[PDB]
């Protein structure tokens, strides 16, 4: 699963929320958070789209968008407010084991970058969504409803942070709805110096190796060496 | 099963050698070439081990006695604390220094 | 009176890097799971008793191979599809009206 700032359709921890980092005191490293229970998220594009085929050569067709029947609205995602509250409480409780018991811990939003790294970018049934997560990471912690995230749709896609190759995604016909599990987070810490009593964490991502490092984290590969010599008291006859 | 006695003593792991022995041979074009090389490398490793065993005079055997006496400078532990209070992973880490000398002695003893 | 004895099939291992292959349960998909080996219904997992190992999450070589495989499959899936070179022309575009909302103003364009 390719996504940014949020881990989807993954694996859940067995006992508690797990916090992993290569060097937790180095703020240049990313923090991987693994949840104990998932957070359900519902995303949708509500427009009724039409697809038209245009013959651009012998045996070659191009799929364009036709007309949108009905009204035009904005694609968006919904998350639960109480569940996110509980999850953030557990996450901050686990975070307070590395930075102290009396440190104020606040969540802010992203800071600078292109559209892929400053938004939750994912793929929902053929359509590439870029959702704004300023309502998820905005709070501070001192020692029924829903959250609606507006999203944007793009059709020219540059994957794997490369240049020189672009992909065009043909339109999907009809209304689109998807439901997913949030099972983890990628965070980065601001280097607050000069006797800072507060810590600020911001969503991160961009490198897909940390997406699959959260699944291949308990495996290793070994090579067998089936030859040994030992002292016995048997002599060749 | 496979690698089951990795935490057991050296004596207990000497009765299940065939389990490890069996699991060494069978247990687009870009990906097709990569998979083929793995099988070729496994075959080559198996054949090199078999050739070494045959040269030492131990062809077609899992346990093989030799005429080379054990030098006390390789290890001073007695048989009671080697085969009953030790694993192969610890034994390798201790005798890794003298392996080549022992191999050369085995070769020159079998040839002569 | 001790002699060297050779054992073939001891439970010893070392750290290594190799090419792992893909398997999938048993058609048009970006990741060609059809071209991978079918998976067994009940895989074997052998618990190694009294064995302590060392792991390093941040220096694992399986992640690099997985990244390379994903990128290669994505690149391979696009070879037989249509090139859109004639689409790089000048478009004449107008704003979209007729039952848009306030938040959807200027997000769609009608281009000829």
């Amino acid at each position, epitope marked *: 699963v390719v996504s940014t700032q949020l881990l989807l359709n993954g694996s859940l921890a067995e006992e508690e929320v797990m916090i992993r980092s290569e060097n937790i005191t180095n703020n240049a490293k990313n923090i991987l958070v693994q949840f104990n229970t998932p957070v359900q998220i519902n995303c949708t594009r509500p427009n009724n789209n039409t697809r038209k085929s245009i013959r651009i050569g012998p045996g070659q067709a191009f799929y364009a968008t036709g007309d949108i029947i009905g009204d035009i609205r904005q694609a968006h995602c919904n998350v639960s407010k109480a569940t996110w509250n509980e999850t953030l409480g557990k996450v901050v409780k686990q975070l307070r084991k590395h930075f102290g018991n009396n440190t104020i811990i606040r969540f802010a939003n992203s800071s600078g970058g292109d559209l892929e790294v400053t938004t939750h970018s994912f793929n929902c049934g053929g359509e590439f969504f870029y959702c704004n997560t300023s309502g998820l990471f905005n709070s501070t912690w001192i020692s029924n409803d829903s959250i609606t995230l507006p999203c944007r749709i793009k059709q020219i896609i540059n994957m794997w942070q490369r240049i020189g190759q672009a992909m065009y995604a043909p339109p999907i016909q009809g209304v689109i709805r998807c439901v997913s599990n949030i099972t983890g987070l990628i965070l980065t810490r601001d280097g607050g110096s000069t006797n800072s009593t507060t810590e600020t964490f911001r969503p991160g991502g961009g490198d897909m190796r940390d997406n699959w490092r959260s699944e291949l984290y308990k495996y290793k590969v070994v090579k067998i060496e089936p030859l040994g010599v030992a002292p016995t008291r*048997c002599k060749r006859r | 099963g496979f690698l*089951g006695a990795a935490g057991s003593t050296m*004596g207990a792991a*000497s009765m299940t050698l065939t389990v490890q022995a069996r699991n060494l041979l069978s247990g687009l074009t870009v990906w097709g070439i990569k998979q083929l090389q793995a099988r070729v490398l496994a075959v080559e490793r198996y054949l090199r081990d078999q050739q070494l065993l045959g040269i030492w005079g131990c062809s077609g055997k899992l*346990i093989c*006695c030799t005429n080379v006496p054990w030098n006390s400078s390789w290890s001073n532990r007695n*048989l*009671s604390e080697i085969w*009953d209070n030790m694993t192969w992973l610890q034994w390798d880490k201790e005798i890794s220094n003298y392996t080549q000398i022992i191999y050369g002695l085995l070769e020159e003893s079998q040839n002569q | 009176n001790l002699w060297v*004895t050779v054992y073939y099939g001891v439970p010893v291992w070392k750290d290594a890097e190799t090419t792992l292959f893909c398997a999938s349960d048993a058609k048009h998909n970006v990741w060609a799971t059809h071209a991978c080996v079918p998976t067994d219904p009940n895989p074997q997992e052998i618990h190694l008793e009294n064995v302590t190992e060392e792991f390093n999450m941040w220096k694992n070589n399986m992640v690099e191979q997985m990244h390379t495989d994903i990128i290669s499959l994505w690149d391979q899936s696009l070879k037989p599809c249509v090139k859109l070179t004639p689409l790089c022309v000048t478009l004449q575009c107008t704003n979209v009206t007729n039952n848009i909302t306030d938040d959807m103003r200027g997000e769609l364009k009608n281009c000829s």
Partner: antibody
Amino acid sequence: EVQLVQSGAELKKAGSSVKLSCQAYGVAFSTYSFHWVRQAPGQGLEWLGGFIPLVGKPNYTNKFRGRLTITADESARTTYMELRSLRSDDTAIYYCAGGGAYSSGGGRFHYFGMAVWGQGSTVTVSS
Amino acid sequence: IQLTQSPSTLSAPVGAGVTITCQASQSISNGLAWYQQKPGRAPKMLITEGSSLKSGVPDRFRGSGSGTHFILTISDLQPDDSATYFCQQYNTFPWTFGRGTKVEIKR
């Protein structure tokens, strides 16, 4: 560590059969040698039998040949001893012991004794 | 194979050393084990392989010998050493125990 747990005391009749169980904790059961010994009141020790479960062919004393059976159960990891046609002199304390062995090839096995002992079971036959 | 253990009984004061001799009817290489037993308790192995000291056993017990003659020596007698000692062979089936020696304390 390794521990052996035996059954309780047994009272039987002459000409009957007695079965004792011994369960092991802390070792691999298939490659560990298990032995049954007995001690008469006020007398010495008498090694009855012993075997490695993997080999599957127990060794017996010629005196008790035809009256003693030693079996194993790897699923429950317990060894059973069956003694048939008990006589008046079979009232004694029976011990279950264990030890480690290795192989030098060609069907040769080398042992080290009986390092682990059970608490013993008292077996008595009378009217 | 028959094992003869001598002396049958022996008593010494605290601080002295005692020796027990186990003699085999035929060569058993060096496959002999020395066991200790206290009244109302299961036997406990002291020495294996003839001279290898078991783990958790005090250094006061020493075993030596070869061929058909083996010796067990207690250098520093202690109040807990009054017990029955056995020598057993495991080199060839069937395994046989010695008659045992009851070491007593003089005070």
